[PDB]
Amino acid sequence: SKVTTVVATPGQGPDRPQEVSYTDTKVIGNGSFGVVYQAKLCDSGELVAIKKVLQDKRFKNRELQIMRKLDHCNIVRLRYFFYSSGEKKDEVYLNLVLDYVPETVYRVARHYSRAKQTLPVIYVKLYMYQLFRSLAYIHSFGICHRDIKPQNLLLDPDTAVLKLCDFGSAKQLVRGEPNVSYICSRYYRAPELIFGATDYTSSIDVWSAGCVLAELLLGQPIFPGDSGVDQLVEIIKVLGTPTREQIREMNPNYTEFKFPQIKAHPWTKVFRPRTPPEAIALCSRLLEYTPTARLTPLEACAHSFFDELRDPNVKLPNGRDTPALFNFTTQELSSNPPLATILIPPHARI
Numbered sequence: 001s002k003v004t005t006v007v008a009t010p011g012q013g014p015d016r017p018q019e020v021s022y023t024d025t026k027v028i029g030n031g032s033f034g035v036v037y038q039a040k041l042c043d044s045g046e047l048v049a050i051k052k053v054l055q056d057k058r059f060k061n062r063e064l065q066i067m068r069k070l071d072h073c074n075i076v077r078l079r080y081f082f083y084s085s086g087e088k089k090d091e092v093y094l095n096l097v098l099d100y101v102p103e104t105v106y107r108v109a110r111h112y113s114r115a116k117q118t119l120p121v122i123y124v125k126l127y128m129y130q131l132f133r134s135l136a137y138i139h140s141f142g143i144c145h146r147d148i149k150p151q152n153l154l155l156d157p158d159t160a161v162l163k164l165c166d167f168g169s170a171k172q173l174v175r176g177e178p179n180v181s182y183i184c185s186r187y188y189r190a191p192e193l194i195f196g197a198t199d200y201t202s203s204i205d206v207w208s209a210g211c212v213l214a215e216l217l218l219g220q221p222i223f224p225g226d227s228g229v230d231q232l233v234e235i236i237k238v239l240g241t242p243t244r245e246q247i248r249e250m251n252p253n254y255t256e257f258k259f260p261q262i263k264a265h266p267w268t269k270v271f272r273p274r275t276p277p278e279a280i281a282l283c284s285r286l287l288e289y290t291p292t293a294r295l296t297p298l299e300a301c302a303h304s305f306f307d308e309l310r311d312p313n314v315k316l317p318n319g320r321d322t323p324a325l326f327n328f329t330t331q332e333l334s335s336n337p338p339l340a341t342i343l344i345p346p347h348a349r350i
C-alpha cells in the first residue's frame with residue numbers, strides 16, 4: 001500500500017511542523033464538510049482518523065481553533081493538522097488528524113437493541129458520566145458542542161473509555177451575539193431551538209445528553225420526530241405541553257404552532273419496570289423545558305446515579321479496572337469547586 005508523507009503541525013504546543021507518514025487510507029464517512037478517512041501511521045503503527053474539509057485560504061477554521069485549545073481524556077485528541085491542495089486554483093483542504101477509536105455508543109446500543117437486550121446499567125453509568133465530564137470541560141471555556149448524539153460518542157470496548165468527537169457544529173457562545181436555531185441532530189434537539197431561539201446557552205448539550213441517557217435505558221430514541229416541527233410533538237407526548245412561563249424561558253422567535261393541551265406522562269411509566277429510580281430521577285433533571293432548570297454537566301456527574309462508579313470495589317464486566325474518572329483539573333471544576341468533595345471520593349483524593 002502506497003505511503004503518503006506530509007509536513008503536519010502538532011495540535012497542542014507551539015507551531016513546530018514535522019514530517020508525518022501514513023498508509024492504508026480508506027473512506028469511512030462523508031458530509032457537507034467534505035470527507036473522513038481512516039489511516040495507519042508508518043512509524044508507530046497507530047490508527048488515526050483524518051477529517052478532510054474544503055477551507056477558504058483567507059478565512060480561519062472555527063473547528064481547528066477549538067480543537068487546538070482542548071486537552072481532555074474524554075475528548076478525541078487533535079494529533080496533527082495539515083493543508084493539501086486541490087485540482088482547481090485557490091482550492092485548499094484542511095486535514096485534521098485525530099486518534100482512531102474502534103466503536104461508538106450508536107453501534108454498541110444498536111447491538112443490544114437488535115438482539116432484544118438492554119445495555120447493562122454499569123455501561124450506561126460509565127458512558128454518561130464520561131460524557132458529562134467532556135461537557136463540563138468544554139462548557140468551562142464557553143464552548144457548546146451543538147451536536148451531542150450517540151454517533152459522536154466514540155468508545156473503546158475493552159477499556160470503556162468514551163471520547164467526544166466531531167466539533168464541526170461547535171461554537172464559543174457569547175451573550176448577546178445571535179446563533180442559528182436549526183442546529184443539533186433532530187432527535188437530540190432542545191425544545192428552545194425548535195421554538196426558534198437564537199439566544200440559547202450550553203444547556204442545549206445537557207438536553208441532548210438527557211436524550212442519550214433515555215435512549216440507552218429504553219433501547220430506542222425517546223423523541224423520534226419525523227420533521228423539525230413533529231419533534232416538538234414527540235417531546236410533548238412525554239413532558240406534556242409547556243406552560244407560557246416555560247415557553248417564555250425558552251426565549252422563542254415564534255410560538256405559533258397551535259398545539260393542543262396534553263398532560264405529562266409520568267417518568268416511571270416511560271421506562272421499563274426494573275429501570276433504576278436514580279436513572280429516572282437524573283433523566284427528569286436533564287429533560288426540563290426551562291433551560292436554566294437543567295443540571296449543569298458537573299452537577300450531573302455528582303448525581304446519585306453515578307455513586308457505583310465512586311465505590312472503590314467497582315470493576316468492568318471484562319475483569320479490568322475502570323478508566324480514570326476522578327483526575328479533575330481546576331479548569332473542569334471551575335463552575336462549582338465545592339462539588340469536588342462529592343466528585344473525588346476518599347480513595348481518589350490527592
Ligand SMILES: COCCN1CCC(CNC(=O)c2n[nH]c3ccc(-c4cccc(F)c4F)cc23)CC1
Pocket residue numbers: 028029033036049050051076098099100101102103104152154165166168
Ligand atoms: C460499516 O463500517 C463502519 C466502519 N466504522 C466503524 C466504527 C468506527 C468508529 N470510529 C470513528 O468513527 C472515529 N474514530 N475517531 C474519529 C474522529 C472523528 C470522527 C468524525 C465523526 C463525525 C464527523 C467527522 F467529521 C469526524 F471526523 C470519527 C471518528 C468508524 C468506522
